């Protein structure tokens, strides 16, 4: 249960680091890439300062949640942090409730 804090989610990566995580995703097949590599990219996106990156990061996490039953619990937590950052408190409330 080694989970992220609010603090981590608010510090961005360099553009070239995020690009590496992106490139790894594309390499493995994009939306069909491994769960680990998709998450790594989704988190980097959530850390980004760009609201649209953050939204995409949250969308990818939702996709993980859907696909992987064994990942739902931890993803609800990740989803809560990402929705919080975006001001999407109704979503964040609902998720952390479940």
């Amino acid at each position: 249960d080694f989970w992220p804090t609010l603090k981590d989610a608010y510090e961005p990566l360099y553009p070239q680091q995020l690009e590496i995580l992106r490139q790894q995703v594309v390499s493995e097949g994009g939306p069909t890439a491994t769960i680990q590599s998709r998450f790594n990219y989704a988190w980097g996106l959530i850390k980004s300062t760009d609201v649209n990156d953050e939204r995409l990061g949250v969308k990818i996490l939702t996709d993980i949640y859907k696909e992987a039953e064994s990942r739902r619990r931890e993803c609800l937590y990740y989803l809560t942090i990402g929705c919080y950052k975006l001001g999407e408190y109704s979503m964040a409330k609902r998720y952390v409730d479940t």
Binding site: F2, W3, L21, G44, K66, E69, S70, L79
Partner: protein, 40 residues
Amino acid sequence: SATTFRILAHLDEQRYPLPEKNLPSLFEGFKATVSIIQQR
């Protein structure tokens, strides 16, 4: 907009419900990967 985000990231919690004590978190792997990226 953000209405498009809300559509694409919509989560039917009833449809995708929650249900393992030996499964490393995804975040652990993120943190290791960002560490190794710092060298490359």
